[PDB]
Structure formats: C-alpha cells, structure tokens
Write an enzyme that holds these catalytic residues in place. Structure first.
Site, PDB file in Angstrom:
ATOM      1  N   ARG A   1       0.411  -1.112  -0.051  1.00 36.69           N
ATOM      2  CA  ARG A   1       0.341  -0.016  -0.089  1.00 36.69           C
ATOM      3  C   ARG A   1       0.985   0.999   0.521  1.00 36.69           C
ATOM      4  N   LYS A   2       2.161   1.399  -0.166  1.00 40.34           N
ATOM      5  CA  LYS A   2       3.076   2.198   0.255  1.00 40.34           C
ATOM      6  C   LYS A   2       2.973   2.590  -1.266  1.00 40.34           C
ATOM      7  N   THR A   3       2.328   3.491  -2.251  1.00 33.23           N
ATOM      8  CA  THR A   3       2.045   4.123  -3.636  1.00 33.23           C
ATOM      9  C   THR A   3       2.292   5.893  -3.067  1.00 33.23           C
ATOM     10  OG1 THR A   3      -0.396   3.601  -2.952  1.00 33.23           O
ATOM     11  CG2 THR A   3       1.099   2.131  -4.148  1.00 33.23           C
TER      12      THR A   3
END
Lengths: 285, 285, 288, 291, 286, 285
Positions: free
Chosen positions: F137-139
């Site tokens: 989810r590190k976008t």
C-alpha cells in the site's frame, strides 16, 4: 453493536456527500430564509413510524455543515415506537430549515432500509437460522453508502460494496466466457489472491462446476426452496469449504422457507428496492 | 406526450450525473472484465413487472459513456406487460456488464415511480377529477432528477424541483416568523415577482389568512376529506385566484376521497417514498 | 432591509464558490508569502467611490477561508461617501494578502451593481413610480450569485435567477413554436402549476395573444415610451390579472419616461452589463 | 494575429469552464424545451454595437457541448460595424435556446473588454508610443480566462495571469516586510530564477531602492504624468535593464499624457472594471420539423 | 529558512488535495475502524532513514481533516539520523489509523525528494559552485505540489511550476517553428512582458542564436562537461545578461563535473524521478 | 496476458484522472501554443531505458482528450531494448506538445514500476518459487491507479487496492484492540462474509494466534529468512488453509532467500517506493 457502526463511515467522503446533497437542494438564492430570520431555534425530531432508527451520522453531518447541533434521545439502532421524540436540533432558524428536507429524506430512507433488514433478520432467527441476511447490489445510484449503512444497522450484511470488493461471476459473465469452468478459471486467475470469487448459478450442475473450479461462494439464484435445499445439501457435502448464498424472489413472508442448515447467506433485493421510508418530522418549537 | 419528455433533461447535467454513478460503482480495477473479454456482444432488456416504462435517457446515457448502443422496442411511457422484451443493448462485453447494474437500478426506480404516478393519475381520472397529481420534495438526495423525471413520465407533476422554484412557507416558517400573516408578507416581499408563494396550512383559519396576505397557493396539509372540501370550497369562493393543493396521508386507495372540484393539486409522498422498483433484467445472448 | 439580505445566500454554495475563486487565483506555490511572513496583521478597507456597499458575505467568506476576521463599520447597503473607512480585516499577513485581490474584486463589482440599481430605484421613485426595478439574465457566467445579490442590496429585483425560476417565452421560442398562441399554450402546458409564464412581445398584437393564452407576465420589449404606455394601458384594461414588464434600451437617464401606472416591472440590462466597479483598497497598517 | 489567439486556450479547461456555466444556468428541468421542440433550427448572431469581436472559442465551446455548430462570417478580432451579421448557429431548437444566454453574455463581455483594449491601444499608437498596453489583476473572479483573452484579442497584454506568473511586491508587502529593500531582497530570494519581480512604488525614492535591490519591473503607481516622466526618465538612465510600468487613474481620455519614451507598460484597470458589454442578439430565423 | 517554507502552500489547495487523497484511500465503509474503536490515542512518528525531513504541512493537513493533532520534535528541514522520534500524533484511534498510510506515504516521498536535493546542493557547495540546483518538470502527475515543495526544503529550486510560469522552448518547439530564431521570436512575442523565455539547446550554435533572439535563459541539454563549460564560457562572454542552465544525464556522482563559474542553474531530473522514499513508521503507544 | 490488462481500467475514472492531470499542468493561458501553431504533426515515442513497457491506456487517454491519436509499435508489456521506437502520436502541434510532459511522466513511472516488478518476478521464478510477487500500500497518493496497474503489467499482484478490498489488521490495530485474538475476532466479526482478514505478525506466536482466530492470511513482517521459513513451515503444517505472506526489508537482491515452498505471497515496498522511472522522449518529426 449498532452504536459503533458510525465508525465505518469515512468522515471525508461523508462531508463530500452531504455537501452535494446541499448544493442539489439549494443551488441559488434562498428566499425562504427571510421568512424565518437567523434567530436561534430548536426543533424536535419525531418518529411517526415503527421500525429501526438508522442514519444519525448523515443527519448530524448535514446539520453540522449548517452550523446546527443535534442531541439524540435514542441510540443508533433503537426500535422506534411511534409517536416518539427522537432528537433535538438547535441552530439559526434559517439554517435549521435549510437542512430539514435533506436530513429527513436521508433518515427516512436509511431507517426504512434498516427496518426491513431487521424484520428479515428477526424472521430468520425465528426459524432458527444462524446465517447472514444480506442486501444486494440493487441500490440507488449515488446513495449506496446510506443504503449499505442502513442494512448494517438493521443487522444485515452489506455484501460486495462495489465491483472491487469481490469478483462476481454473474450469468452474463458465464455466457461471455463460454461456460462456467472457463468463467471461473478466468475469474480465479484474474482476481488477486486478496479477493474471493462468487458465481451465480441457476442449476446444481453449474454449482458443482463452479465449486470444482475454485469458487469461494456459490449463489443459487431463483431456486424454489424444494429444489434449493437438496442442491445446497449436496454442495456442502462435496465442498464444505464453499459458502452457499441464496437469492431470487425472496420476500419477508417466504424467507423462512429459504432458511436451511446448508445456506450460509440469504440476500434479498427487497431490503433496498422495496423498503418504504419511515415517517419523520422536524417540528420547530 | 411522454416521448418528448426527454428534452427536459439538460444533456450536460445528465452526463455528469451518469459519470458519478459509474465512478461510484467501479472506483478501481475491474477484474470481472477479464472474465467476459472485450468481444462484441448483445443483451436483451426484459421487463418482468407491470407498470410504466421510464428512464430511457438515463439508461442510454449510461451505455453511451461505456461505448454501447441501445435500441428501444417500446417508447418512453409505454405500459409494460410482463414478460416483455423492451430493448437491445450492444457493445464490448465487458463494457455492457459494467453498465448493467447502474442502468437497471436507475430504470427500475424511475419506472417504479412513473408506475405509481400513473396509477394515481388513473384513479383520479376515474373519479372525474381534472386537477394535477403531483410529487412532493420527499425525494432521494442526489437522485432527485431521475425521480422528478419519473413522475413526469407517469403523468404527475414534479412540484417545486428545489427551494428556488417557488417560495414555500411550511409550518416551521410560520412558527419562526411568529404567525401566518407575518410569514406570508415576508415571503411575498422576498419572493421575486418571478416566483409564486405557497403556504402550508393545517386549518381553514390559516388558509384564509394566507390567501388574504397574497399567497398564490394554499397547501391544505393533513386534512380528513370531510374537513378538506368544505374548507376548499370556501377558499375558492372568497379567493378564486388562489390555487388549492391537498397533501398528507394520501394513498392510491383513498385518493378519490381527496379529489373534489375545488382541489387543484394533490401531492402524494408515496409516489417517491413508497414506489417499489420494477423488476428488469439484462440477459446477454 | 438590506442587512437581512445575507440570509438569502446558502452558506454551502457560498463556500464552494469562494473556494474556486481562491484556487483560480493561486493554483501553485505562493512565493510572495515569504515577503510578508505570517505575523498577525491588520488592514483597513477603504471606499474610494460613491455608491452603495454590497458584498460583505462574500468578502467575509473569502477571509474566513483564509483564517482572517473582518469587522464592518458600515452595514450592508450603506451609502458610501468617499473616502470612507469601511472595515478592518485581521489575520496572518500572508493570508490577508492572499485574499486581498479576490475580496476587493468581488466587493467592487457587487457594490458597483448595487450602486447602479439604487440609482435606478431612486430615479423611478423620483418619478412617483411604485413598480419593481429589475435586472436581466444578462449576467457574468459563473458570477451570477454575486450579481443577483448586488441587485437586491441596491433595491432592485433579481428576476428569474435561472431558466428553472419561471418559464420565459422569448421571441425565439415564438419563432420555433410557429406563433405566440402555440408557444404560450405549449409553455403553459409545460411550466409546472408552480411556475409562471412570461412572454417577450414586440407589438400590442403579440401582447394580447399572449395574455389571451394565459401568460402571467408580458414583457414589452424595445418599445419607445410613446408606444409603450398606450399598449400597457390597454393590456391592463382587458387583462388586469396580467403583469406588464418593460425592457429594452432603458438607461438611468431615460428611465422616468418608461415609468407609468400600468408598468409593473422595469428591467435594465445596464444594471449588470454596464455598472462600473467601485474603487476599494485594502491598506495594511500593522504587525505583531 | 488575433485569429491565432484561440490556440492559447487549453481545450480541457475550456470545456470544464463552459460545463460549469451550463450547470449554473440550468440546474434542473428545462420546461421551455417543450415550447421549442427539438426540430433542427438556425439562428443568426447579430452585432448591434461597435467595437472588436472577441470570444469565438467560448461561444463555440458552449454550442458544441449542446450539439450545435457555429459558422463565423467574421474572424476573431474583426472591427464590428453595427448592425452586422456575425455568425450562424445550427442545431436542435431547444439546444440552441439553452445555449443562447450564456453564449451571448460571454461574447458580450469578452468583446466589451477587447473593444476597450483596442481603443486604448489605438490612442497610445496615436501618440506615437511603442509600449504595451496591459490589463490589471482587477478581473471578475471565476471569469479571469475570458477577460484576459479579451484583452489579448484587443491587442493589450494580459499581465500576470495569477499570483504564480510573476512575484508582485505590492505596497502592502512593503509594509509587512518593513521596507522596500527588505521586501525586494525577500522577494528575489524567494522568487525562483524562473520568475521576474515587480515592485509597486509611489515615489521616485522607492523606485530607485527597488531597482537597486534587483527588481525586474517597477510599477509607478498613481503618479500624475508631470511627476511620472521625470521619474521614469531617471530610472531608465540609472537602470536601463529595469522595465517601467505606469498605472493608477489612467483613462482612455488621459492615456496619451501617460505615454512617454521611458514607460514600457501602461496598465489600466478600466479595461476590465469599466468596459461595457457589447450588444449581441441571436435571432432564430428558421425552424424545421423533426422527422 | 526551511521552517518558513510552509507559507508557500496556499491552505485552500492544500485542503482540497488532502481531501482527494483521503477519498482515494477510503471510498466506502471502513470496517477496520471497529477493530480500533474511537478511544483517544497517541502514536509516535519514527524516522528510520537518513536524509532531510520534509512534508510537515501535508502531514498536518491530513491529520487535521481527521480531527487529530500533531506535535513535531524536529523542525521542517532537519537532518534525520535514524532511528529518531520525529513527532507525536494524537486523536481518536480509528481516525489516527485512517490517516496513517496517506500521511506516511506523503512524508516519505516529500522527504525522499528533499534528501536527494540536499545531497545535490551539498555536492555542488563542496565543489565551490554558487549556482542554483533545480528540479525538472519530470514530476508525478497530481502530486507536483508535494514534490516541488520537497525540492525547496532540500534547498533546490522548483523551476517552472507549470507551463504558465515561464515560456519554455523545447527542442520540439524548435522543430515545429522551423528553427531556433523563428521559435524564440515567436516565444518572445507571445510571452507577456511578465514572463521569461528559456530555450533548450543541444549545440553552441543554437545557444548563440537563442541568445541573439532574446532568450532570457539557455538550457544546455545533454552536453558532456568538456563540451559544456567552453560553450557556457563563450555564451556568458558574448551575452552576460543571459542565464545558463545545464541538464541531461546529471547524477549526484558526476554533478561536480557539471559545476563551473558560467553555469547559473543545474537541473536534475533524478531529484524527483529517482529519489527513494524515506522509511517512516507511525507506532501507536496508547 | 499483459495486452488484456487494459480492460481492468474503468474508462470513466480514467478520463477524470487524465482531466485533472491536464488542469494541473495548464490551468491558464498556454502561450507556448503560439510558438508551435496548430498545424498537423507527428511525433515519435522513444524508449531510452531497458525494462517493461506499461501505461499505454493512460498515454492514449491523455492524447485522446487533446484530439491526438497514438499508434503503438509494441504491445503493452513488451521488453524494451533501448533505443527503441515505441509509438507514433499524431495531431495538432500545440495539442501534441500540451500532452507531452504528462504523458511521458505517466508512462515513465508506470513502466518504471512494471520493470521493477518483472525483475522481481523473474528472480523469484529463477529460484523455482511458484508464489505471487506483490506490491504494498506504499503508493503515491492520487496516483495509485497507475502504480497498481504498472505492477500488474510487470506480472506482480496489486494487493488490496484500498482499505475496502480486504480487512488488514496491522500491528497498530493489535495494540489498539489489546491483543491479536481480540483484534482478529473483532476483524473477522466486522469483515463482511465477502472479505478476507489478514494479520501483520512479527513472531510465530502472533501468527499462530492469528490463524487460530480465523485469519485468512498471515503477513510475516520483517523476519530474517532463517527465522521466516521455519515459522512459515509450521503455520502451513498446523493451518494449511491459511495463506502466508512475507514482507519487510525485501530487495531484488535478497528476494531469492525469502522464497520458500510455504510462502504464498511476497510483497515488496521497493516496487513502488524505489522503482526509478524509465527514460522516454517524444520527438516531433
């Protein structure tokens, strides 16, 4: 716990949604404001229908934008016995009256849906069924969040909130893929390991093929109960890992006939399509 | 002419509305698209409920955004005798299935409302009443345009579309202003010469005060029919220029009792709050 | 009461409108903020033009978004005698200066329109006319709300705010429908029972046909006054229930010639098209 | 070349802008549509005022959204001699009439501004001035794009389109920074190498300090002409690299007094604040029965 | 002064931006909220990477929307020595956890960019260069404001923020106009007196033509350093009023070779296209 | 099939996204348009970096809004060997140049991510691992759709697209609930029947508690490989129904050490947080 369901609503999407409803209702000059003036006022919220109370977060959000406060005398999810005094709203007269229509409409529909859901949940509990009653994707466009939330307050399950919540292989997907096996393999391949696959089936044959191809859920669509439970019983026997959902022509009246030990989920379109709104009023005192 | 009602919809607000419904329903990746593929396809729209068909412009707008075409075999406003083949939709399989849910949900509700309206219009015509059946402001937030349009297709009047359409003095405005005379003078003074003033009244006394102060319309709210017509008859006698609307606890069943020669408008909340959606399906062939 | 007109503005559409003005004016990095810093400051709002003050709600809404407060020394609608100290704005220096341009531009135009309206209202009162002076639909796109509000503050009527406020049968609608009777019947059958029908007419003939077909209002467009009053007098005689509006080539100068006992409304495009903005400035006088 | 100015408008912001105007004008049901019907029709656009024609891209964009076409008989920037037939618009009757008001209002104001600008440009050319006439930031909120475009068509310069176009040190920035030198140093250090700094000055004193601190432009605000040119002459002498702008109480009438060989830019608030709209009408001349 | 850079951000565009990030991340029902409940809580923000701290205004704006407060133990622009306790966030548990991912992602990237910029600024100062290090237009769409701000915190220049900030004549504009002289004359005419013109040049020939036609800046694109400085030296000699920018294949490693007394600006597309995000975490301790 | 991945993108959200990028980049007057003029032109898209090509739908959508067409000489997902001629764009010169920067920036980042993902997928295949490589989810906020799509093109899994895709119990949720069992029971109770629950675990102890409480997935966070596989092996032994994901400090270099027969998913933050953009240019000819 219906009181803690308010946490589900992301406050940012809530405000945006409420904003749009307020622009929708008064796009230009509000001449009626001159009739009431801006003097501080108080209104009483009256429940005139039986059912379940649902929608407080939306009701609050509306009046908050409009610089009014709300005090609730009944918690979210309470049974409503008309004619009951449910809440008090306070603020500038013109701001109160500006929020009245949208707030009542929203509360009426959310509560309408929660009521229907709770009736269905009760009927199913009354036939000793342990499964989940659920809504369908048959919601009002743009108003999905209020309707799915109403279902939850009434004790029903929301189901897939959108197309991204789980991969749903409807009968049309089967036709397009050229068969159940092809559709479910395609679905299972495409769907991230994060997602479940559900397949809409009209026969025991399809249901077995679907389970064989790795369907997590099987939706037995439009079965008569006499055909449904035998089918469900076999599916659970051969495939205990696969969940069984029943849907199609289910009413509050016939719901107990659709309950059975091998049905995990029952989803009813009427909970959102046919749920009449509750009668509420906001009387300024 | 129900076929020419589509002209009422501004195409720009239509597209924006349809857009938001489509973002609402699929915000992220559409995995189910891989199940159907993009091959050209055709689906049949089936009417499974009786009533009136309403919502074609919305249905079309949805499928046009998704690069599909629609061919209608029944004009807007047609009586539906189930099970009828209503239309054909053509386009890439995945695009068809993407629009299915929103299009059906929209058509179901718009037609649901139109059906209810047409039933009420028929009942009133059957009691020899020449007046206008109308909806109320009790609509679903964000979905007002579809619902007001449905009413029109069913032969009912939309009423004030928003707060800017006419200046409505509800009972709360009366309380806030300190009395009918004060409220109506304030309203009449604020309302542009462009706008009509309508006053919600619970007694003949209020109704007469309202007319005396220059109300264009008088809404006789929650009268029993036996009290209503005498009241209406006097109002028209003293004030022939003032229109009389009746509302409150009106159902399709009791509607004929509320019809009378001195009632110009009858508005029913049930046309929008209680109108059940029609059953439609879109079967890919 | 011009002070109570602020209630007409729905606070939600107001904030949205003000927001867009502020994105429009500073979409990216505000380098000038480093010149002023964020120290608390005070500015004085100066009226340098005569006319009527209008636009406070917009002016406030702008500065509230920017965490500044405003104190008004004159109520909404006050006559302005330059050079007058109208208000004080307080807040972080950079936030004040960020709102300055949009706030002044808005106040200048709203007040400009109110001024013109009040001049026209006065001229008409000075000729003993009791009717309503009104604006037209000739407004700036996207800025309608400020302009219609300005008209109200100056004592004029807004007219139809949009196309949904009343069903207006212009000369083009007549051409398209194939005649006045056809157009007005179509209009009357369309406009909900909740709406009035108005018909734009260039002759007495059209005006009579329009009234006969159930027009609530008749707009006598581009008449010379000598042709107008005779026409209006007859209309009122045959049709006392029908309101008569006059419009077309009306200026503040010739307005009294257009006033008459049978004209209910006079609408002037110049109130919005040709109303010069008032001169205002916001002079910063403080720090800490 | 006024015909090629349409390229300046990004078609995406254009459509968005036009969209909002159309939602603003008809938010709900359009009952008047039933009066006209949807039969094909043709309307003639009439110029009833003298001036310069400006706003075609906006006019087109409006009618394109409403599935109507427009044919122009005069190019963008043409002198208008009333009463002239300027264009034709074609499309479904109800769609035509839906666009009429917004289209005219837009064209009227854009042309109004272009007219005023062209008058000012002509007056300045008539006094042998070679500089740029410009508008100010005194525009209508939300309508800036139309107004800045109108200025360009009339031959005037837009100036800074927004606060990000150049770093403008107004008199209030000076007060807040505690002085011109502090403000201009702050400004230039702040400004990117990308941007010019302009300083609003009320005296020769300030102007010199501003130039000394590296101002690219100096705006001589509210000078009487007699005080202005001597000041401008000196500035240009000591600082030839610095551009000189004059503004404040400039009217079309007094504009020639403000022109001089050492004034590079003259910016007039009246070009946008006080420019009356031109009179245009859209008269339908034909309707035909739908099929 | 990196602490005062927060003033650059218009608070209205900030809120809108933060809003959209929050709708993006949670469009529907937040079921995980039921796991945490709404009880007041406190979380510690941990810096696990070296570099420069940048993004506080965004981080704050996110948590303010969600009714949480933030207390910073390091000012904006501080050097980060892992593992450092940077801040404390307080608020309802569910609201804290709702903001966590967007807030970290934003701070990680903004700080990542600031770190890279500060490294480049240091390398250039270490080679005695007085000019401006700058970013390019090679930014992430929709995220430009955070990235340009990160550059500023790290001590680099943003460059043109958008197409309206200065008129940039790239090589494609030259092709389309039919030549440098034609392009620059067209550019200089078009551009308001308010704007500077910059021209992207691949040879000394183009650079001289550009300066002759009134270019305010000349961007010497993709030169090898050995060709660059001789070119730059001549340009400055003939045209001292014209600024010289160098760009193309510049890395933190080779940056000192590109520094020279006649280069005013060095812009590196990696400051934003290759700048690894910093590792941050938000650990709830109550 | 990387060519068919374009179907995943809902065309309505795509257009909206592209729109915003174009307003972001040119909010006001485009003076540079006067330099190029509007004459028809053609530009060549050049790949100057090795890796995987990803982002065509976005690239197209950008240029379609600007009335330009694109012809691709390589399909979506192709290996790029610089210096390669990848596409041709045609349209009015000023419109081409208006889209250039946004289009390249988008394609560069999408392809950057796809490249990294494909490298990781290859390394894992090279160590005989059959599992799914995944993103985290590190976008980048607001750019999630492009980045998740890039991952898919490179052969990696997107993971949960948002918070609604699956119920993720991170270490902070554990702290807040007061323990793993409490958190997972709460999660499992709240998650719809349609959703999976995943629990972030830092020890074998937590992992076993999580599986016991009905976690569908267990994320073994920040294990050293020597501790990871023994832990994973036991979990799979006791709980074969539970999927095991590994994450934390995983690089392309050390990825093979993290592969093992009992690891179902490996998710790497570097695929999105560290993936350098590919060099592309658009040269007008």
């Amino acid at each position: 716990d219906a009181e803690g369901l308010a946490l589900l609503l992301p406050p940012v999407t809530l405000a945006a949604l409420v904003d749009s409803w307020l622009r929708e209702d008064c796009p230009g000059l509000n001449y009626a404001a001159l009739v009431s003036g801006a003097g501080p006022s108080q209104a009483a919220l009256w429940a005139k229908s039986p059912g379940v109370l649902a929608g407080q977060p939306f009701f609050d959000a509306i009046f908050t934008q409009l610089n009014c406060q709300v005090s609730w005398f009944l918690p979210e999810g309470s049974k409503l016995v008309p004619v009951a005094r449910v809440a008090e709203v306070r603020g500038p007269a013109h701001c109160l009256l500006l929020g009245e229509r949208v707030a009542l409409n929203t509360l009426a529909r959310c509560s309408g849906i929660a009521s229907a859901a709770a009736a269905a949940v009760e009927a199913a509990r009354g036939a000793g069924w342990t499964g989940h009653v659920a809504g369908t994707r048959k919601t009002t466009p743009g108003f999905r969040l209020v309707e799915k939330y109403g279902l939850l307050v009434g004790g029903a399950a929301s189901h897939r909130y959108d197309l991204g919540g789980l991969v749903m292989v409807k009968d049309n997907h089967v036709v397009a893929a050229g068969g159940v096996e092809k559709a479910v393999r395609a679905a299972r391949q495409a769907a991230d390991f994060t997602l479940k696959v559900e397949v809409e089936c009209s026969s025991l044959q399809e249901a077995v093929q679907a389970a064989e191809a790795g369907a997590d859920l099987v939706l037995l669509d439009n079965f008569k109960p006499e055909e449904l439970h035998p089918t469900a019983t076999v599916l659970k026997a051969q495939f205990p890992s696969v969940a069984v959902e029943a849907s199609g022509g289910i009413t509050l009246d016939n719901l107990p006939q659709f309950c059975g030990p091998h049905i995990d989920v029952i989803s009813m379109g009427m909970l959102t399509q046919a749920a009449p709104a509750l009668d509420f009023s906001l009387k300024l005192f």
